[PDB]
Amino acid sequence: SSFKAADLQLEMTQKPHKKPGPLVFGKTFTDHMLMVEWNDKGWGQPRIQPFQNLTLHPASSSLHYSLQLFEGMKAFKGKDQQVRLFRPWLNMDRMLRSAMRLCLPSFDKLELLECIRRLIEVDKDWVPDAAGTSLYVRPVLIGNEPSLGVSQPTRALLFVILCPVGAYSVTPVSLLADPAFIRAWVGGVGNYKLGGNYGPTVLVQQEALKRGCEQVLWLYGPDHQLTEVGTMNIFVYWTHEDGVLELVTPPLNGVILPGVVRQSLLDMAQTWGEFRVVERTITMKQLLRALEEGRVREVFGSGTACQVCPVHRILYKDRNLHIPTMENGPELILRFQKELKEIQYGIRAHEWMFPV
């Protein structure tokens, strides 16, 4: 049985921290945090407590065998000072799938959300309201076994911390495309937001920077499929081989993290009904022929941190490939950003937004 928002225990801080004045993504934390413990007696009571360190047994399964998963989502403060979470239900859904994959304890998704709402409420004033700013919400679930056996955890901790953030802005990025690097494999766990999928990318992101690129384009398979950009899903807006203009993104076949922003761009594009929206594999072969025949209009990544990130260059086989994204407006990118902004900041009412 899940923990209950009704059972929440609140402990306000004695010394509130001084709010910020140029925020650096994920370094500034708010006064409070959520924490819920799990053990053989099930879930304890959730609590909002002052932001404080974790105390873990040195054998903690979180640190030895990566019994760890996370989420990332944003709360936005509208003009009316009202704070809203964007599509949080989908993050709860994904978090639970991640939990099950790692044999971590199940929880009630609406209970956790209410606990998160309550936490954001307590820290409302940390939510910035300046243009392009938001509150980043980082839920985490970790195993906490005090023994070295690789086994289903009998102890777990669920916590949530909050960071006020600005951008991460609408400047295009260059990508290193090198098939030697493989982010995920069919039958793997690339489709879950597990900490173990990110650690190994640090070295690869460094190679990208040495080779004068800003992000990694993760290729998969012998046909060099374009899967993801850094921690973002990848979209290509082009006139396809059959002469039809379309928005394509790779399908959810196991090596793709099902992004919330990704699904939202699909939803928006489908709703407008102005061009084909498809989920289909994208190979470098197709991209090169499309670039050579001038069929490519825009390439970009989607994710919570950047929202929509234009791509202007891919360094593939030591040879730079120009992506004409910015030369094409980037119309679709700008259209996506505008509607998302209007929705997120409450300019248009929308079922996608959850009020705090």
Ligand X SMILES: O=C(O)Cc1noc2ccccc12
Ligand Y SMILES: *Cc1c(COP(=O)(O)O)cnc(C)c1O
Residues annotated within a binding site for substrate: 136
Q: Does 303 bind ligand Y (CB under 6 A)?
A: yes
Shortest approach of ligand Y to residue 88 CB, angstroms? 11
Token representation of residue 234: 């990848």
Token representation of residue 106: 């199940």
Q: Which does 217 bind (CB under 5 to 8 A by kind): ligand X, Cl ion, its own copies, none?
A: none
DSSP structure string for 158-203: EEEEEEEE-------EEEEE-TT--S--TTSSTTS-BGGGTTTHHH
Amino acid at site 252: L
Nearer to ligand X (CB atom), residue 160 or residue 290? 160
Binding residue (CB under 5 A) for Cl ion from 32, 47, 77, 87: 87
Kindly identify the residues of this chain, within the stretch 57-76, that bind ligand Y according to CB under 6 A. Answer: 72
Amino acid at site 134: S
Q: In angstroms, what CA-CA distances link 129 with 137, 321, 342, 344, 346? A: 15, 38, 14, 12, 12
Q: Can you say which residues are annotated as belonging to the binding site?
A: 136
Q: Contact region for Cl ion (CB under 5 A) — 25-33, 45-53, 247-255, 275-283?
A: 247-255
Nearer to its own copies (CB atom), residue 198 or residue 272? 198
Q: Does 170 bind its own copies (CB under 8 A)?
A: no
Q: Does 68 bind its own copies (CB under 8 A)?
A: yes
Q: What is the DSSP letter of 328?
A: G
Shortest approach of ligand X to residue 225 CB, angstroms? 20
Query: What character string, x for contact with ligand Y (CB under 6 A) and - otherwise, covers 309-348?
Result: ----------------------------------------
Nearer to its own copies (CB atom), residue 13 or residue 147? 147
Residue 355 backbone dihedrals phi, psi, to 5 degrees: -80, 140
- In contact, 184 and 258? CB cutoff 8 Å: no
Q: Does 225 bind ligand Y (CB under 6 A)?
A: no
Determine if the peptide bond prior to 330 is cis (ω within 30°): yes
Kindly identify the residues of this chain, within the stretch 242-271, that bind ligand Y according to CB under 6 A. Answer: 257, 259-262
Q: Which does 60 bind (CB under 5 to 8 A by kind): its own copies, ligand X, ligand Y, none?
A: its own copies
Token representation of residue 53: 């360190």
Q: Which does 191 bind (CB under 5 to 8 A by kind): ligand X, ligand Y, Cl ion, none?
A: Cl ion
Q: Does 144 bind ligand Y (CB under 6 A)?
A: no
Q: Does 268 bind Cl ion (CB under 5 A)?
A: no
Question: Under the rule (CB under 6 A), what is the footprint of ligand X?
Answer: 26, 72, 148, 150, 231-232, 303-306
Torsion of CA 251, 253, 258, 264, to 10 degrees: 20
Q: Can you state the angle between helices 88-101 and 260-272, rounded to 10 degrees?
A: 130
Name 351's Cβ contacts closer than 8 Å, sequence gap at least 6. Answer: none
Q: Does 106 bind its own copies (CB under 8 A)?
A: no
What burial letters (b/e) apply to 337-354, b meaning 16+ CB within 10 Å?
Answer: eebbeebbbbeeeeebbb
Kindly identify the residues of this chain, within the stretch 224-263, that bind its own copies according to CB under 8 A. Answer: 231
3-state secondary structure of 209: helix
CA-CA distance, 126 to 146, in Å (whole number)?
A: 36
CA-CA distance, 153 to 129, in Å (whole number)?
A: 40
In the complex, which residues of this chain contact ligand Y (CB under 6 A)? 72, 193, 228, 231-233, 257, 259-262, 302-304
Residues in the site for its own copies, rule: CB under 8 A? 24-27, 29, 33, 51-60, 62-68, 70, 100-103, 136, 138, 140, 142-143, 146-153, 159, 161, 163, 179-182, 185-189, 194-203, 205-206, 231
